[PDB]
Amino acid sequence: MEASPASGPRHLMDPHIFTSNFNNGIGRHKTYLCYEVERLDNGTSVKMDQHRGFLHNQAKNLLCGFYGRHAELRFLDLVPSLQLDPAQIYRVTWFISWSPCFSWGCAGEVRAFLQENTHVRLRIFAARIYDYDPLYKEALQMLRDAGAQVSIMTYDEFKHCWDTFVDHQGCPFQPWDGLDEHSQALSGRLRAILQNQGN
Ligand SMILES: [Zn+2]
């Protein structure tokens, strides 16, 4: 009920940088984390333009004291610089390509965040699963008890997240040939973990 939803022709990742990065079917590259900040007003979610961004894993300077750190951590590191205003409600959307790590390290950090700032809705989206151990399981549960929304990246999210996290300057998304395949596959996995009753 207001003109129309804006885009983001600012300085976003290059069309290719995004695709190649989210190249469905990886094995080793660099975890990606796209955080989106939005305010909740009477069911009316207003997506901010100059408040969102994206990060990438880092592990090549552990000699300077900055031991290997995940994007999730290096990310929240900017929250203190935003001095959020709990005055109202907020909506932080997480877009991850790589599954979480030590459910206690990554998730834990978030858990406390909510337990202290439950005035914000955190949505977790896992596009690709890849870690050191299958611990990702406990991560799904430990998080579930947090209230956060855990789900696998969807096609609809790909289109939005695309034009949203890209300087498409007004260009469509390029999906690979096999969405129902990788989608049904991944989605099938999550469900499995979500299936702990009935039999
Ligand atoms: Zn982590």
From Swiss-Prot:
Catalytic residues of the enzyme: 72 (proton donor)
Further details from the record: It is one of seven related genes or pseudogenes found in a cluster, thought to result from gene duplication, on chromosome 22.
Functional description taken from the UniProt entry: DNA deaminase (cytidine deaminase) with restriction activity against viruses, foreign DNA and mobility of retrotransposons. Exhibits antiviral activity against adeno-associated virus (AAV) and human T-cell leukemia virus type 1 (HTLV-1) and may inhibit the mobility of LTR and non-LTR retrotransposons. Selectively targets single-stranded DNA and can deaminate both methylcytosine and cytosine in foreign DNA. Can induce somatic hypermutation in the nuclear and mitochondrial DNA. May also play a role in the epigenetic regulation of gene expression through the process of active DNA demethylation.
Domain CMP/dCMP-type deaminase, chain residue ranges per copy: 27-143
Entry EC number(s): 3.5.4.38
Principal EC category: hydrolase
Major localisation: nucleus
Disulfide linkage: none
Binding site for Zn(2+): 70, 101, 106
Effect seen on changing residue 60 to A: Altered deaminase activity and restriction activity towards genetic invaders
Underlying gene: APOBEC3A
Swiss-Prot/TrEMBL keywords: Antiviral defense, Cytoplasm, Hydrolase, Immunity, Innate immunity, Metal-binding, Nucleus, Zinc
Reactions it catalyzes: a 2'-deoxycytidine in single-stranded DNA + H2O + H(+) = a 2'-deoxyuridine in single-stranded DNA + NH4(+)
Phenotype upon changing residue 131 to N: No effect on deaminase activity despite an altered restriction activity towards genetic invaders
Cofactor(s) named in the record: Zn(2+)
Impact upon substituting residue 136 to A: Altered deaminase activity and restriction activity towards genetic invaders
Subunit structure as annotated in this protein's UniProt entry: Interacts with AGO2. Interacts with TRIB3 (via N-terminus).
GO terms under cellular component: cytoplasm; nucleoplasm; nucleus; P-body
Protein family according to the UniProt entry: Belongs to the cytidine and deoxycytidylate deaminase family.
PROSITE patterns: CYT_DCMP_DEAMINASES_1, CYT_DCMP_DEAMINASES_2
Stated name of the protein: DNA dC->dU-editing enzyme APOBEC-3A
Claim: Ribonucleoprotein is one of the keywords in the record: no
Signal peptide: none
Induction of the gene: Up-regulated by interferon and CpG single-stranded DNA (at protein level).
GO biological process, any: clearance of foreign intracellular DNA
